[PDB]
Amino acid sequence: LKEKAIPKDQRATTPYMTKYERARILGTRALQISMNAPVFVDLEGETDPLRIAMKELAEKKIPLVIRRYLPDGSFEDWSVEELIVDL
């Protein structure tokens, strides 16, 4: 099935990013950055992959998307770009 993917219109999870989604985005991006992936932000003299990832997140220039699974197995995909980062 692909009744699994919940559409952009009519989506209901928090429009905010979870503490976990942040920890995993920062980690994932720092891991990718750390193993020589192209960086989408201008490192203004930055060198720690986490600090670079944080800059990436701060400028919403992280090209990842969170696939939020529901208990039935369905999902809502949310872009790092669109999620509110209060935290």
């Binding site: 503490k19 980690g27 891991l31 020589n36 720690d48």
Partner: protein
Amino acid sequence: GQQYSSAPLRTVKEVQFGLFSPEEVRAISVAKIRFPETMDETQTRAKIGGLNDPRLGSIDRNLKCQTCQEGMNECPGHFGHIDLAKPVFHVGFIAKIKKVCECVCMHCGKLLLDEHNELMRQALAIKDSKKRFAAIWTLCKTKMVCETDVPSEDDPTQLVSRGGCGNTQPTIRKDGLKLVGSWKDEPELRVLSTEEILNIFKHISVKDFTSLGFNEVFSRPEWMILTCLPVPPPPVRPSISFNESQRGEDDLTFKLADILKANISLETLEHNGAPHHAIEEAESLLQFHVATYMDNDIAGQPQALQKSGRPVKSIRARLKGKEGRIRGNLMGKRVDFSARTVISGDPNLELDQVGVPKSIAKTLTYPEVVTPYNIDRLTQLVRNGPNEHPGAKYVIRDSGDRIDLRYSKRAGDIQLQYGWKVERHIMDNDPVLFNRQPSLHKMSMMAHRVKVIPYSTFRLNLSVTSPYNADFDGDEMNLHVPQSEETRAELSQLCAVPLQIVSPQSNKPCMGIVQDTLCGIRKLTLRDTFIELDQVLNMLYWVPDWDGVI
């Protein structure tokens, strides 16, 4: 683990539990285990065509495996098989086998109570695979007639034949690892042969056994009875082979040779001049060794003790918790990149720091990838060596091969390359998990900023004493170093001391001012207490943030 494989890498999404069919056991087998011996025949101390045997995996560090030719680390090991001279009950199913016998006619294999019976109809409807078998059993256990005919749903006067013979059913009892029946002047008493039980089970219809708890594909009741025994390869029963002229076979290797010995005894006994009341003797023995191999700590039976008198590790006992594979090797594990020493508190560390003794910092490493950002720093640490503090221990090439900086003849002229990993020393501000056991809290494990210090104790801020439930009465704590840019992020962003300050246990903070600082704060903050300029200036300077305003 370790070598490259073209095979697609996936994750286990499901575990389908089931029983081995004898047919599978043979198909899956790499050796027909024939002799109890392990080697030394023709003279040569090297594995025999019978037990252990190369067909199964390697004893030596040979590179040979015969089957996969992969060698000890890579080879998982391959199953052999023993064809048993007579069928034997799998010790762990004796009670279920008895309950299946209690539900079915011990002659025609029909399930004693039909969908003709109203209570049975209700019991059959039960969707729970197990609760159904419970209800089915309670109804059929007290049915001692395999009915030929039964009263029809339409009218109970004009009876309808439901099928099945008209045999009396036995009152089954468990006597050791045997099942004895009692039919009906005076009842008839005889043991039910493993063959007989099996034959009756083989005659139970798919519809009948799927109505019981069973499965047509994965667990047919007849597979609870063993005819073809799988032989676990050497990695399950490692021969701890010390020196040349010595070995050290595992308990399981002995118990399997016992099974083997008992089996040949039986097979030669039945084939030759079978006294038939000496055949039943050797069969009981084979039943004992196959039972006692899987479970040795059997209810009201003697233990199958070793030469020593030492009880013998049953496969069951291996997995039985607190130290079993499950509780001790899987839910818990002893782990690499971990340290432990006596803790002692420090008023000059920040709440979220942890004082790491130089020796500990010099042992634990972080695998940092050579990248344009660190390439320069990393070459300095490699230069420094494994002995200076900010240094490194190993350099991992693109090839995946490890360079030991302690001995490499090129340890001084290493020129790093982007992609290589430098396994450097843990340095100040590396996030690390710090833990005081028992771990009853979220807070009994928190993430701290490293501070490499002298002296052999882990130093911690006194206000973090409370969540850990630590004293300096001689208490020791564990440090766990993360290895991924990702797992560090997890520690720093999710479990670092400052985050853990206001605990959800009581919707209040789990850390506060304590001891000297609590005692002294009351003292300082009195109406009576005043401070002369000299000291005011020192007390200001001591606040690291202080705006510079007197």
